[PDB]
Amino acid sequence: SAKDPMNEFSILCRVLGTLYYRQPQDPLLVPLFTLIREGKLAQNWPLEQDDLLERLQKSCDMQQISTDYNALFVGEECRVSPYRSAWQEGATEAEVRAFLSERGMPLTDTPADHIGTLLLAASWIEDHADENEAIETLFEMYLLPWVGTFLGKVEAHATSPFWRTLAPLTRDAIAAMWDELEEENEE
Ligand SMILES: [Ca+2]
Ligand SMILES: [Ca+2]
Ligand SMILES: [Ca+2]
Ligand SMILES: [Ca+2]
Ligand SMILES: [Ca+2]
Numbered sequence: 001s002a003k004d005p006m007n008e009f010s011i012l013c014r015v016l017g018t019l020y021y022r023q024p025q026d027p028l029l030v031p032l033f034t035l036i037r038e039g040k041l042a043q044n045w046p047l048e049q050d051d052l053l054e055r056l057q058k059s060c061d062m063q064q065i066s067t068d069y070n071a072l073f074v075g076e077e078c079r080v081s082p083y084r085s086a087w088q089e090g091a092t093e094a095e096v097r098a099f100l101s102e103r104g105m106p107l108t109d110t111p112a113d114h115i116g117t118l119l120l121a122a123s124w125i126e127d128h129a130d131e132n133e134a135i136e137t138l139f140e141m142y143l144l145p146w147v148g149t150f151l152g153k154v155e156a157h158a159t160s161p162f163w164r165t166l167a168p169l170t171r172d173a174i175a176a177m178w179d180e181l182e183e184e185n186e187e
Contacts, residue, residue, distance in 0.1 A: 002187065005180040006126040006135055008046040012177070013122040015041070016170055020073070020082060021116025024065045036060055047176055052169045059161040068160035079157040080150065084113035087146040096142055103134055115150065118143055136185050139178055147174060 015032070022029060035041045037060035042053040059065075073082045085091045097112040105124055107117070118138065125134045154167040 003180070003184050004132075005177065005184065006122070006131070009177050009180075010123040010126040011044070012046050012173060013119045013126075016166075016173065017116045017119030017121075017123070019116075019166060020170075021114060021120065023074075024069055025062060033060060033062065047173055049169060049172065052165055052172075055165045056162065056169070059165060061160075061162070064160045065162045068158055068163045071159070072154060072157060072163065080153045082115045082150070083111055084115075084118070084142060084146055085111070087150050091146075099137070099142070104128065113142070115147065132181075132185070135181060139181065143174065144178065 018029065018032065024033070036053075036056050039054065039057040041056075042050050045053065072079050081087070083093070084096065085093050091113070093111040093113045096118075097107060100107055100112050100117075100121055103121075103125060105121055110117075122135065122138060125131055125138065148171065151167050151171045155164060158164045158167060
């Protein structure tokens with residue numbers, strides 16, 4: 001019987017996708033930042049990233065975090081565009097939308113190739129799905145080719161210790177998840 005690693009990685013994808021997709025000062029995120037600021041996230045974390053989550057715990061200044069998020073990702077004049085189409089040549093938003101639509105994923109009027117949306121789709125696909133064939137295409141075609149470049153620019157342009165930690169935390173998490181999935185994909 002094969003491994004279902006997305007069974008444990010679903011929550012990590014939803015947590016990270018939430019942090020890239022939404023303004024940190026959204027009242028809906030208060031219980032999430034309470035877990036981070038209280039260090040309660042590492043006990044239910046499917047990776048071993050204790051020292052990064054500890055640095056996340058000590059850097060929870062919501063005004064500092066909010067300012068950095070807006071400078072990095074908000075508007076057409078942001079510091080590091082969070083869309084796949086800004087990083088991969090030839091990439092279009094329509095093809096990611098269509099891929100997510102055919103899996104049954106509800107989308108908004110904001111472009112479907114946002115880094116947050118791609119990560120949220122990974123946990124949505126884990127929860128309502130052919131699931132593993134959908135997971136491999138999401139990562140191989142719409143994440144791995146470009147996300148390392150984006151996350152590296154995030155780390156260089158983030159002025160806050162929170163986003164200076166989250167960017168490499170995301171980088172390590174995606175590569176660690178991919179190794180576990182590929183070991184089952186190519187088994
Ligand atoms: Ca390996
Ligand atoms: Ca491994
Ligand atoms: Ca593969
Ligand atoms: Ca195996
Ligand atoms: Ca093996």
